Amino acid sequence: EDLDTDNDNIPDAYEKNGYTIKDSIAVKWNDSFAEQGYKKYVSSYLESNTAGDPYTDYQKASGSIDKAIKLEARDPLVAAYPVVGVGMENLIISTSAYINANVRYYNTGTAPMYKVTPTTNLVLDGETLATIKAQDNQIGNNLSPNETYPKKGLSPLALNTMDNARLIPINYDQLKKLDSGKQIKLETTQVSGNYGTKNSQGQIITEGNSWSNYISQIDSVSASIILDTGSQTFERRVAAKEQGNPEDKTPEITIGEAIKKAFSATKNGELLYFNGIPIDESCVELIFDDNTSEIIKEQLKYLDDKKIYNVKLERGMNILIKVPSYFTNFDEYNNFPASWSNIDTKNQDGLQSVANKLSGETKIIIPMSKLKPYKRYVFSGYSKDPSTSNSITVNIKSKEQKTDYLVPEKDYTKFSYEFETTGKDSSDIEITLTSSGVIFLDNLSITELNS
Amino acid sequence: EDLDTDNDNIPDAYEKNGYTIKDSIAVKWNDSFAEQGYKKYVSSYLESNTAGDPYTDYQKASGSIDKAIKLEARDPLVAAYPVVGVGMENLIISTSAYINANVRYYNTGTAPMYKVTPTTNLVLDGETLATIKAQDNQIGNNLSPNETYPKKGLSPLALNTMDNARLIPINYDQLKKLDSGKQIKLETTQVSGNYGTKNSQGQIITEGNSWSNYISQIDSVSASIILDTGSQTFERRVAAKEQGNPEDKTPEITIGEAIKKAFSATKNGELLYFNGIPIDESCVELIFDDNTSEIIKEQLKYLDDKKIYNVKLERGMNILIKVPSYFTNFDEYNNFPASWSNIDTKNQDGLQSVANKLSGETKIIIPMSKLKPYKRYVFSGYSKDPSTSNSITVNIKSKEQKTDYLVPEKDYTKFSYEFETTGKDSSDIEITLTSSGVIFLDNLSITELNS
Amino acid sequence: EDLDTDNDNIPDAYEKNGYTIKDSIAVKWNDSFAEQGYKKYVSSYLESNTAGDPYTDYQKASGSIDKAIKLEARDPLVAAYPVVGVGMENLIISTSAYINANVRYYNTGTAPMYKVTPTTNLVLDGETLATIKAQDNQIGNNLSPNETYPKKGLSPLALNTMDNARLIPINYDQLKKLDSGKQIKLETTQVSGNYGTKNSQGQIITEGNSWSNYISQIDSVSASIILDTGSQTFERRVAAKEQGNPEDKTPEITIGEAIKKAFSATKNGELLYFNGIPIDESCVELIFDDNTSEIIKEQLKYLDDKKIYNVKLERGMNILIKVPSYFTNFDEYNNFPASWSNIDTKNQDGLQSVANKLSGETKIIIPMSKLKPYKRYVFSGYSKDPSTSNSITVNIKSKEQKTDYLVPEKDYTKFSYEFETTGKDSSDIEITLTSSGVIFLDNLSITELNS
Ligand SMILES: [Ca+2]
Ligand SMILES: [Ca+2]
Ligand SMILES: [Ca+2]
Ligand SMILES: [Ca+2]
Ligand SMILES: [Ca+2]
Ligand SMILES: [Ca+2]
Ligand SMILES: [Ca+2]
Ligand SMILES: [Ca+2]
Ligand SMILES: [Ca+2]
């Protein structure tokens, strides 16, 4: 119909169902439009800001917003939210004494943030020396997603102003405590910035607009999703509905659909690829917090499929995704520098094409040249054993030798094992696993964890 | 009908009786809506802001307000009020001498408070050293309810700037008592901050909107209710009606309804559950002030039920709900570290399901490890004795030996006894009670009180 | 009727007579509404603001103003005037010399003052050491009537900054007189604050709304009335009409009616009770100025009743009411620690119920425990002697012994005497009176005058 309850130029019939913006006017979503590249949009018919961001659903869908905004924020269910941070690249202390910090701001969101004014802490150990705001010398006029200030190839900017003043560790006992080898850290409590909107005269203005107004609203109606690809990180917020309220019309979508919409990962039939790096559930290690783990494990058993990506996305959940550094599937990807032992690729019972036909034991000798010292690593993989009569024990060499037993199930089951490696010029890491009979292995992964 | 006296989009007939919001408009309430999750709202038909908070009745009921405002405040009777406080975490003093403090801001209200600018007094002992207003370094851009700034996982911000000036004790006369073991406390006299409204351009503006405009209004037309769950404290304000004003149409509700509205506690027929922690009258200890206590006691005689949760909420009341630390009912919960002595659960005369059939005396050993030193506790419980012929005396071992006698009544009655414990490495606390004959006991509670 | 000269929604015919607000419309006043709790309002029909305050007659009568304003100001003839003062709690001086003071603002009016910025004087002996205006550290965001900033239980705030700058007596000359025995007083010259109005969009704004615009106006159309209850103080302004102007329609009221309106005192038949404390003319001592006393004295002589509360209120009157500390009426309230001697209650010719049938002399022994040293007191009472043949002399022991003779008249008359008590550990205070024959006594009162 032509019923517009929320007054955002899209009828409630089109928002309940699918719709797409064609020639700036919303039209019904027809399945034939998919091959032309038109994306299907859904939203809430009782709210003009489904995700909580400053821009309405129509402005997002029709691309009527700032053209520096990434195309993942054009989906009404993905919020335009800058994630700014501060990184200390070089610290200079000299003479009490005086401290100089080299900083460079980072952005990892789906929107640019003008007039960046970070607030930072200078903590040594628990005690905070001072809290600093970015003076007019250290404010960035522009900051674009996936870009830094100053731009790449430019030297970082200093930090030597307290209010016209100079940063000082007023207590020389702090200097003596630093003399013991305990460095000074840097953390960002808050960042201040603006956004851009057009006025009645057609001119973008970023003066009165503030991002601090639309932080509490967005952080309360969305679910945090983080992607880690080793070299870069991407943070997204996806709007989720509240369960108790019957007037909440936000669409209910799965976790896999949320990832696909948030990161614009192409889906070639069933698999998910972000930028040529697979992000499928079996091809990456996911990390949750306590509440999200409880929700996932409770909702999993109600579903026969038993897949995390098929679980409905709820409000407040956290989904951290960490792309494994070393991944092998015996089909099209194997980045392990050292070859495996006792591998047979002649099989057809794998997860996608083939599996590993192991008869005996598998041992891998990984050089530590391509390994990060003083880091925690987790080895994971999928195992299949219809026999259910063989016990698998693993021997992994590390700072502390670990020996654990595994009981394979009838179907595919994932195992997670954690070990710590200390010292670059230390003993070589030895990983060994033995099987009583014939076992199937697929998607062996090595994933870095927090240090 | 369609008569709107105060012009807030809700007719008088719907505000006098129950009403609910459906598709951004208000409709008459029907009991069949309870299953679907809809709620029955009531408010005054002569005032457009029943609670006193900036948002009207229609915006509160229909959720036209900020999305960081808890759904507890969507009831037109519960005001959205930010209760922000400040407390020290680390004290830094160095050389006259200089003093530095580390603080973190806590919000326990039901509405976010933007641009937090607290004012604190640095009182050593009686004498006030300084009155500090938060500078540009110590302002919190956002503060969501039940959230702190800096958020969890971040070091507290240092408070050093006095004017850019340095904090200083003028003379060492204060340092004389400081060397003797005196504590410099930090207390918050007031707090400055903003609130969010939607302008005519669809954006949220929080610059001309301040909370210091509505604080006197909210605090004067409301009854204060607080809940202390040991670690988390929630403070609420519930609008009431004037006593001697015929032109005040604020709905009249009891204490139980007020608590259920304020804290959104679910009600399973007769009991009351907040978040899995029962907060019913017989499972918690209530602390009042003088005027509220006298009002309740004078209103209890005219009531046959003699239950606090059935007393009408009057403007100006002060209620504090302290969840007991140790509480057992012998039915579905017993958190006492050590089992009781001489307990018989075979009974059918309990307050809810069953009682305890004690014939003789009961002694309980409470370990010294799980008790807070230098703190005051209270022993609470229920007693039933139809015979009314057995006298009960209690022996309590503490810093000072206490022995009191109790005379049970025909029906259930609550007895409160106060004792003090000092010293972590002191004598173990021993509590002994003796009964002449056979008595019934239920809901044995231990409530922690202020030092 | 249907005529509104001043355009305040209240017809002239209703303003000239009584009127009341019912469902936010002015209606004619009938005497039957008294039992329902409604009040009768009368106001000038040629002025929109009768009392001078920013709130019009309709806003005051219908309660469409700030909800923190006391109901005593809802009367159009009573102005909403905040009386703010600063009290000095402690004085610390240390090193030429630096002075630091702790203060706590007080409010004793019927309106709240936002953004209180008091101005203070530092005077030792005639000379003014400095004049101080509070900076952003000493500004109270909210200050409700009968409340303080900081609130109860919160330590006072330190006043030590003059402009970054520390207060200083520029020489030891101001230090010698402190050793001599002269203390430093602290008095407030003026107070700067804001009031609260609701803007067009429906929000409360308190920025440009200064109280300094309506101090000169209100003080010049009213008559100050102060009530002292020993501990607390209530200052009020009641509108009165100019004597010479024929175009002044401000309603005329008596002093008793003005007091009842201003303090919302409850009148139970003939007695006037404030908060259970009688404020009837017999139970209080009235203090006026010179001009007020002259006008009252010249106005009683044409009045049959011969009572102060029956005198019409005139513009410029200054009335102060003092509630006696020790008041005995020999009926229901004898606060004297020591009982009287030679008293007979067998009488029926008292002022209200009974009198004191004295035949001889009456003596009372009063200890210094309930007496404040260095305080001046006034002894007052009522006497009735139809015979007019007995001379009464009073013997009072004090710092200076006083013996005065009295000649009672035929009817009831009030007698007053002045004496001072010096020294806590001084000679015992002795009060003795002798009656030649039979006399009637009632309502003996003691009050604490200025030191
Ligand atoms: Ca729509
Ligand atoms: Ca919409
Ligand atoms: Ca495969
Ligand atoms: Ca209405
Ligand atoms: Ca209303
Ligand atoms: Ca029970
Ligand atoms: Ca009029
Ligand atoms: Ca008028
Ligand atoms: Ca009498």
A54/B158 Cβ within 8 A: no
Going by C-beta distance under 8 Å and a sequence separation of 6 or more, which residues neighbour residue C278? Answer: C271, C272, C284, C323
Cα–Cα distance, C383 to C412 (Å, whole number): 5
Going by C-beta distance under 8 Å and a sequence separation of 6 or more, which residues neighbour residue B2? Answer: B11
Write out residues 111-140 of C within 8 Å (CB-CB) of B.
Answer: 112, 114-115, 136-138, 140
Bond from prior residue into B118 cis (ω within 30 degrees of 0): no
Chain B neighbors of A161, CB-CB under 8 A: none
CA dist A442 to A85, A282, A334, A358, Å? 38, 9, 12, 11
* C184 secondary structure, DSSP code: P
Query: B20: CA distance to ligand 4 center in Å?
Result: 13
Picking from B94, B144, B155, the nearest residue to A220 by CB comes out as B144
Q: Is A179 annotated as a binding residue?
A: no
C334 burial (CB, 10 Å; 0-12 / 13-18 / 19+) is middle
Going by C-beta distance under 8 Å and a sequence separation of 6 or more, which residues neighbour residue B425? Answer: none
**Resolution number, Å:** 3.7
Query: B145: CA distance to ligand 9 center in Å?
Result: 60
Q: Is B354 annotated as a binding residue?
A: yes
Cα–Cα distance, A252 to C22 (Å, whole number): 50
Cα–Cα distance, A72 to A236 (Å, whole number): 9
Number of A–B residue contacts, CB under 8 Å: 109
Q: How many CA atoms lie within 13 A of C271 on its CB side?
A: 11
> Distance from CA of residue A280 to its chain's centroid?
14
Bond from prior residue into B54 cis (ω within 30 degrees of 0): no
C38/B192 Cβ within 8 A: no
Query: C412: CA distance to ligand 9 center in Å?
Result: 12
Which contiguous run of DSSP H or E holds residue B273? strand B271-273
Q: Can you read off the two tokens belonging to residue A437?
A: 């009979």
Picking from B90, B155, B204, the nearest residue to A213 by CB comes out as B204
Residue with the two structure tokens 């305890």: B356
Mutation for C interface: B217, B249, B289, most C CBs within 10 A: B217
B56/C202 Cβ within 8 A: yes
* B283, B272 Cβ separation under 8 angstroms: no
Q: Is C224 annotated as a binding residue?
A: no
Chain A neighbors of B276, CB-CB under 8 A: none
Nearest to C371 by CA among C426, C334, C333, C417: C426
Tell me the helices (H) and strands (E) count for chain A, helix number first.
6, 23
Q: Which chain B residue has the Cα nearest residue C21?
A: B247
Distance between A176 CA and the closest CA of chain B, angstroms: 14
Chain B neighbors of C22, CB-CB under 8 A: 247
Cα–Cα distance, A306 to A318 (Å, whole number): 19
Chains C and B touch (3+ CB pairs under 8 A): yes
B130/C160 Cβ within 8 A: yes
C207 burial (CB, 10 Å; 0-12 / 13-18 / 19+) is exposed
Write out residues 31-90 of A within 8 Å (CB-CB) of B.
Answer: 46, 48, 52, 54, 56
Picking from A162, A171, A216, the nearest residue to B164 by CB comes out as A162
DSSP string covering C410-435, please?
SS-EEEEEEEEE--TTSPPEEEEEEE
DSSP string covering C165-180, please?
-B---SSTHHHHHHHH
Chain B neighbors of C156, CB-CB under 8 A: 128
Q: Does the CB of B268 have a partner CB in chain C at under 8 Å?
A: no
At A88 the three-state DSSP class reads strand
* A189, A121 Cβ separation under 8 angstroms: yes
Cα–Cα distance, B107 to A64 (Å, whole number): 37
Write out residues 392-431 of A within 8 Å (CB-CB) of B.
Answer: none
Nearest to A296 by CA among A280, A319, A278: A319
Picking from B133, B187, B217, the nearest residue to C154 by CB comes out as B187
The 10 Å Cβ neighbour count of residue C365 is 13
- Beta C318-322 vs C222-228: how paired, if at all? parallel
Nearest to A288 by CA among A241, A323, A321: A321
B164/A165 Cβ within 8 A: yes
Cα–Cα distance, A254 to A263 (Å, whole number): 14
Cα–Cα distance, B160 to B166 (Å, whole number): 6
Cα–Cα distance, A137 to B199 (Å, whole number): 33
CA dihedral sign, ordered B422, B425, B430, B431: positive
Write out residues 190-219 of A within 8 Å (CB-CB) of B.
Answer: 190, 192, 197, 208-210, 212-217, 219
B161/A165 Cβ within 8 A: no
Q: Can you read off the two tokens belonging to residue B442?
A: 């239920």
Cα–Cα distance, A392 to A403 (Å, whole number): 11
Query: C357: CA distance to ligand 9 center in Å?
Result: 11
Query: A331: CA distance to ligand 3 center in Å?
Result: 7
* B428 secondary structure, DSSP code: P
At C275 the three-state DSSP class reads coil
Number of B–C residue contacts, CB under 8 Å: 110
B76 burial (CB, 10 Å; 0-12 / 13-18 / 19+) is buried
Picking from C67, C115, C150, the nearest residue to B189 by CB comes out as C150
Q: Can you read off the two tokens belonging to residue B101?
A: 């403090």
The 10 Å Cβ neighbour count of residue A448 is 19
Cα–Cα distance, A19 to C14 (Å, whole number): 62
The 10 Å Cβ neighbour count of residue A232 is 12
C66/B216 Cβ within 8 A: yes
* B98, A168 Cβ separation under 8 angstroms: no
The 10 Å Cβ neighbour count of residue B271 is 14
Q: Can you read off the two tokens belonging to residue C141?
A: 């965001």
* B37 secondary structure, DSSP code: T
Cα–Cα distance, C308 to C293 (Å, whole number): 10
How was this structure determined? It was done by cryo-EM
A112 burial (CB, 10 Å; 0-12 / 13-18 / 19+) is buried
Edge-to-edge strands of the sheet including A318-322?
Answer: A233-239, A222-228, A318-322, A285-287
Q: Can you read off the two tokens belonging to residue B223?
A: 């009854």
Q: Can you read off the two tokens belonging to residue A185?
A: 């850290």
The 10 Å Cβ neighbour count of residue B216 is 24
The 10 Å Cβ neighbour count of residue C105 is 24
* B366 secondary structure, DSSP code: -
Nearest to C53 by CA among C23, C89, C79: C79
CA dihedral sign, ordered C364, C370, C373, C375: negative
Instruction: Enumerate the β-bridge partners of residue B194.
Output: B114, B210
A133/B90 Cβ within 8 A: no
